[PDB]
Each structure stands twice: as C-alpha cells, then as structure tokens.
Design a binder for these strands. Sequence first.
DNA 1: TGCCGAGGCCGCTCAATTGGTCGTAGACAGCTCTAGCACCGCTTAAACGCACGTACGCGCTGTCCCCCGCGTTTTAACCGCCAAGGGGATTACTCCCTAGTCTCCAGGCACGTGTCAGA
DNA 2: TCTGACACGTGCCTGGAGACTAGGGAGTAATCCCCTTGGCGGTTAAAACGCGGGGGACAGCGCGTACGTGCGTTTAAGCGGTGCTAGAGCTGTCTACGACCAATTGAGCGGCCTCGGCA
Lengths: 97, 99, 97, 93, 92, 96, 79, 79
Amino acid sequence: SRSAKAGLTFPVGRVHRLLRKGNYAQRIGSGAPVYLTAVLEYLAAEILELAGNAARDNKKTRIIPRHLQLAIRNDDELNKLLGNVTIAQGGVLPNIH
Amino acid sequence: QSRSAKAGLTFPVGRVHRLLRKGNYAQRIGSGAPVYLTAVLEYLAAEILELAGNAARDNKKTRIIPRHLQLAIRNDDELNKLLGNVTIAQGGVLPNIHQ
Amino acid sequence: TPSELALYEIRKYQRSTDLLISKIPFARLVKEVTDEFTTKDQDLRWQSMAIMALQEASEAYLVGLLEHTNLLALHAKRITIMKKDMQLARRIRGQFI
Amino acid sequence: ELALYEIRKYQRSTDLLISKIPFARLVKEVTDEFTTKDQDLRWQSMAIMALQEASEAYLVGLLEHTNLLALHAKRITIMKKDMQLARRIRGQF
Amino acid sequence: RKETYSSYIYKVLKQTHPDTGISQKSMSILNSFVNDIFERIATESSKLAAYNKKSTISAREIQTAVRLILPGELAKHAVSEGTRAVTKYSSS
Amino acid sequence: RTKARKETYSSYIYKVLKQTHPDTGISQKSMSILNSFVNDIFERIATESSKLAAYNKKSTISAREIQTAVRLILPGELAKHAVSEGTRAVTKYSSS
Amino acid sequence: DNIQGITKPAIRRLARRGGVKRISGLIYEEVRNVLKTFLESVIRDAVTYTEHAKRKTVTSLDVVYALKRQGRTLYGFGG
Amino acid sequence: DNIQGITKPAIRRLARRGGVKRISGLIYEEVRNVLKTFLESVIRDAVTYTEHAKRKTVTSLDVVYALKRQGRTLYGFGG
DNA sequence: TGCCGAGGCCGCTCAATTGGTCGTAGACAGCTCTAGCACCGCTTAAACGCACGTACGCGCTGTCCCCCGCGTTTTAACCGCCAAGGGGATTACTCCCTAGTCTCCAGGCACGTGTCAGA
DNA sequence: TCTGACACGTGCCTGGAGACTAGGGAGTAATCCCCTTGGCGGTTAAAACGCGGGGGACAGCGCGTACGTGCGTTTAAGCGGTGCTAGAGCTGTCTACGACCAATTGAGCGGCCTCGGCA
C-alpha cells in the first residue's frame, strides 16, 4: 500500500481522493497527500496520549468524553487551537475564584 | 446584445459568470445563477451610495470621502451587523460621551 | 454554615457532566419557537437526536455567560450577581446584545 | 472642563495620532526576530500605512471597553486592573 | 491591466443623484465591499451543493445563501430584486 | 436491498491507540468526537492551501503549500513537530 | 407559557457550574430572555437548511451546520 | 528602546478618542505591551506569506491577508 | 446480581493499484527601470521636565432589606407499553441542460488633457 | 488665491457573445419499513409555597496622595533634496509531471455473536 511505503497507519490513498473531489484546485501534487496524512496522524496520536493519562489517574480503563475535555483545557497549545469548540458531555474545569 | 441589458441591470453579468466558473466552487454553473448574483450586488452597492451621499449633503459637501461612509454604516442597524468586523481607513468613530 | 453550603454546591456541579434542564419542557419550547418561522399547514418534525444536540449547545452557552457575569461582580466588590452585570457582559463580548 | 473639549475634538478628526517615523522603526525591529541574519526583509511604503491604521483602530476600541469597566466600579479614572479584565471577556490576543 | 468595479459604481451614482462626486480612496473602499460580499455568497452556495450531494450551483442555491448571510429586512429586498431579474431575462 | 456504506477514521484511530498502550479502551461516544476532530483539521488545512495557490496564480497544491498552511494554522511548538513528521514521510516515501 | 418551563431551581444549578455564590431575584427573568434570543438565532438558520433539502423533518446535521455558521463548533453528533 | 517612541502624549490622545477623562500613571506602560503583542501576531503571519512567494519585500497585500486571517478585515488598501 | 456495550470473525463489493499516453503548467535564465534606503541641512512643532495645588480614590462605619434555609403540600416529569401512519431513503428511467470549441468584434482600460472643488 | 485631484477623450486588444454537438446529472415516479407523534396509567422525584432571621449591599464620611495645569528648556520629527543599487515585474523556452483511461483483486464495512468492565 501507499501508507506502508511512507511508514504510516492512516490511509494515504483515501486522503488523495478527498483532495481531488473537494473543489480545492485543478491539480494535486504527488507529495501533497503524503504530507497531510502524516500531520493528521501526529495530531491524533498526541491528543490520544493526553486523554489516556487522564483516565489512568482515576484508575479507569476506558476513555470517556470527560477525559478528552480535561486533556485539552489543561494544555496550552491544544486549548488555543480548539478555543471555539464544545465537547459534548465534557463539563468544565474545577475553579473557584 | 449584452446579457445585462436583457436582465435590466448595470453591473456586468458576463464577468460575474466567468469569476464563478474559475473560482473552484462547483463543477457546473447554472444559467440563471450569474443573473441572480449580479442583481444582488447592484442592490447592495446602491444602498450604501444613497446613505453616504445623504451624509455628505448635510455638511453641504459635494464629494464623498471615507468619513461619510463610516457615518452611514454605523447609523444603519442592518448594515452595521453585516459589516461588524470591518475597519474603514480614515473613517474615525461616532461622537459619543457617556453620562 | 450557609456559606460553606454554596461552596459544597459549586464543587458538586463542577464535577458532574449531566444536563441540568428537564427534557420534556425543553422540547416543548423548541417546537414553539419553530412555529414562528413556518406558514400555515407547513409544520415540521424533529429527530430525537437533534433536540439533544440543541440542548448541549444551549447550556454550554449559558454557563459561559454566567461566568463572565461573576467576574464583573467581583470587580465591583460584591458577591451577588445583578442584572446590570449580565448586561455589561453581553456588550463587551459582541455576539448578540 | 477642557477634558470634555478634547473628547469632542479628537472624536471629530480622522487622522493618525502616533508619529510616523518612530512607528516604522518599531515595525522593522519586530521583523528582525522572525528572520535569520542572512536574508533580511524590506517594507513597501503603503504596507506600513496599512499596518498603522489597523493598530490604532484596535487600541481605540480596547480603550473604550476599559472605560466601561471603570464606570461599573463607580470611578472615572481608568486603571491597570480595568484593562486586564477587558481582555479576558474578549478572549483574543 | 487591472479589473475593478469602478466603471459601474460611478454609473449607479449618476442615475439617482447626478451632481455628487466621489474620491479615489472612497472608490477603493467600495471595491473592497463588492468582492467581499461576492466571496461570502459564492462560498456558502458551494457548501449547500455539497451537503445535498449536487454538482451544480443554480439560482436556487444563490437564493438560499442570501437568506443565511444577509440580515432580516435587507434580505427580503434582495430576494425580490434578483427574482425580478431572472423573470425578465427569461422572457428574451 | 442493501444500505449505503459510511466511511470513518475509527479503524485507524483504534490502531494508533493499541500501539503504545494496549490495555486502554475507548467508548463509542469518544470515538465519535475524535472523527469530528480529524475532519475539522483536514478542512482547515485544505481550505488554507487553496487560497495560497490562488494568491500566487498557480493551479496546483503541492507539498510546499501543505507545509505553509500548517505553519499558519497550528500554534507555536505544535507546528514545529508537525513539520518534522511530515517531511520525514515524504523523504521515506520517495526513496522506494 | 413555555418559557416558564425553565424553572428557577434549574437556573441556580447552572450558576453553580459557573462558580456563583449569590443570585439576585431579577436574574431569573433575564436568563430566560437570553435563552429565547439564542434559540431563535439558531433555529432560524436550521429551518433554512431543512427546506433547501425539501424535507419535513429537522435532522441532526442541520443543527450542526447552523452552529458552525455562527462560530460555535460542536463535536460529538456528526460532522 | 524603539517601544519608547510611543510617547505618553500620544497614548493620551488615543484615549481621548475613546472617551476617557482621567488616566492612572501605570496605564502608559501597559498599553505599550498590548501594542507589541498585537504587532507580533500580525507580522508573524505576514512574513510567512512573503516567503512562500519567494520575495524579499513585504507588500501591501501580505498585510491585508494576515489581518483577514484573524477576523479583522480592512477596507481601503487594495484588499 | 446479571449485564448492555465493547470487541473479535466474515461474506461481499466497490474503491485503491498499476501501467500507459498526451499536452501544458511550472521552473529557469536574462533584462529594464521603479522604488526603497541612507544622507544632509535647516526650521520649528512638539516632547520633556519640574514645582504646585486639589479633586478623587479609598477605608471605615451604620442601617435596613432581601436573599437563603427549612418544612409541608402539590404538580407533572419519568417510565413502560401501545397503536398508527407520514415520510425518509433507495431505485429505475429519460431528456434536458451545461461543458467544450470555434469565428468575430465591441466593451473597458491606459495614456493624456484638461480646470474647479477644497485648504 | 491657488492648484491638485476629479472627470472627460483616444486607441488599441482581449475577453464576451453566437452557434453548434454530445453525454451525464437532475427530475420524476414508485415502493418499503423505520421512527416520530400521541395516548395511557403508576410512582414518586422534585418544584412550589410561606415564614423568619440575619448577612451583605448601599449611603455617608473624612483624609491624604497622585494626577493635572502651566511654563520654560531641549530634542528630533518633518520637509526637501541628492545619489545609489536591490529586486519586483515581465518575457520567451522547454521538459517533467499530473490527468485520463482500463483491467484487476484485496482492504474495509455491515451483520453477528461472545461475554466482562462499570453500575
């Protein structure tokens, strides 16, 4: 496959089709789908490692939407990227002024 | 003749048609889409021009400067929230003192 | 102590992730606002999952606005939020006012 | 009160209020910390005018919100805690 | 060559009030306005065709996008201006 | 009489998880949230790459366009690590 | 009288999740007015998406597109 | 410093345009830090646009695209 | 206590791979002249600084009122179960409408020449 | 009073209009079965109601520091020239790279069971 060729897990060939049919440009370069697939897998693996720590402190085994909210609001770079987003059944951060 | 005088318009219909076909919006463009979109752009342009020219004839002026456009946008309710994130160069602010 | 009761209650509801408005009365208010955007004999239905998406986003908006209202009451050196704090907050963040 | 005479004055004019030569020396200094030593950049003359118009429209707007927060606390003097609270409720920059 | 809307804006002003003028920086501000609203409508009609899995932008799409982007009584006067123009174009 | 098939990223999000920590799980409501995250970042980078090409009068989106959009969209230290993972893939891909 | 189904003890629990200690009696009617305003702005845009598709039922995707239209993205109900 | 060329008399005129009557002495240094953080947010994005085009001069269009990128649209400079 | 929800098997099919060909978009190198950068000297608008007076911020104390807490009564939300039926969702069938392509020529832009609206 | 910017006139050329051919997207039927709406009764979680008391909001107070005004000394901004050279914008060639097509077959999905972490 084209994902094994680049050392990746996400699908390179599916991302190539979504770029060709999304009305972005007339032509798509050969390395464009490979670059964008590696950035997507890095961001997923990163948000998934922070939400696993949150669960492994409460001695929980399965990740629930509350754990995703704590990881994002507690991180400086993720909080600014996702600053206009609402997580369903997430809650708030504990805080008493 | 021109596809603008057929529709009774002044803005150019055939140029808005080309800008749609070359802007990466869809694979096909309908025949009546450029006629509808040209008519909305001329209605909106002639509404600003009327409000701004009304402000300029209060000061007994004969020419529209950027200060007159700012005064007409912030005094119209609907036109103010359409352009609520926009800065006009050399416009200024509305006179306002708080009690 | 009546002051440590409100502290006990701020701790309790900042840990939960539930929806705090009842479900049957909230769904009636959404179907009444809809009748004002439709004409005669053109009524619309709602999927049960669309009413739940609209309730998760309304309470996320109300909790975020009551927290900026609390910040404006501590600026005037009170602990009681007034109607005049909520008005100034809607004006500083220019979303609806 | 000539404090009211000058609010009326400066709310009627439209020209820039910072001096132009010092402002361009600060824009060329901030640029030197985003580039390497080797390849330095130049600025068009109308690109500095465009950046100064947007800078003062941002500061005038933020000082209006700061003034609203001083009257909520029964004062007429703006203070440093008024400008800090106005940026939390805005959530930008 | 550089294309603007300066040619037509100046014809619309002289149809109603034929003794008013306009300055060069005012005309530059009205160019930024016309193709800012063009960008907003054409970008929303593009999402409408994809959400419904169509390949075409038609007058029906242009109409639905003007209702989303323009505020209340501004949008009602524009839906009647564009409908009147398609009825007259199609009688030719 | 058959149904239409829906495409997600769930097959792959679950492999990246079982890779570092094989004993942790994930719930069906958490997997739905993570699909909206991947689809949102995809569209942000693809929409910004489409303007960069039009501002320069090109008709091609290249790996050079993807890289510039990633620097405009991601903040700070997050964008420094996303440029290293992405150039190491294009180097490894085209060495075969 | 459907705005009155948003009861007073349920507005107190929303203010607790925001960190509030005391509430004024004139707050409860003001909170109801802000929810009514916010609901009309979102439902108006979601019925426009429904009638473009020529449907007679508001779906879950219509609400998600109406909220993104106003800068409030929501994850967890479809994208 | 170059940030010191933004003088106190000039800051005081910008506050007269905003409607302020009286100013505490610690405001002058806090306004200089707000301007420097705003300039670094925009110039960072405008140098990225310049170098993708392989130019060595910042143009008037690079500043307009960087401002629109952050929800501050400017009319009247060729946008 | 079960126990509803993760989590591994499993037929079947449509979407990813591979191998060619065709024309054009992008890379590259050279050249013309605009505009950005640095200097100089004079002129004077505006920033600087330093003593003075006073209005405003701020802390302290007092009075009422209006929020909170408790306990009884009353309302209607929540749940399980039912029947009915509108309309979402898929499927064949066709014919109209748009892209693609050439021949022709007028609308719109740039270089000039004016002379009158704003200090 | 003055004159610089608005407004009016040539002079060419590129982008719009006209006529056609062709093939797939869109509009229209028809069918099936999921899921929205409405009704019923139980049972009981939770809202509604009233009373009493006491803590916090709000007004008045006096003092003292720090902001604002004026006035003269001191700095560097603004305006104008002149000279220099980097690099923006244009043009003509040429070849590598991406769209297009077709014929294969394995990845990924839907429909199942099996049963075990959270309550």
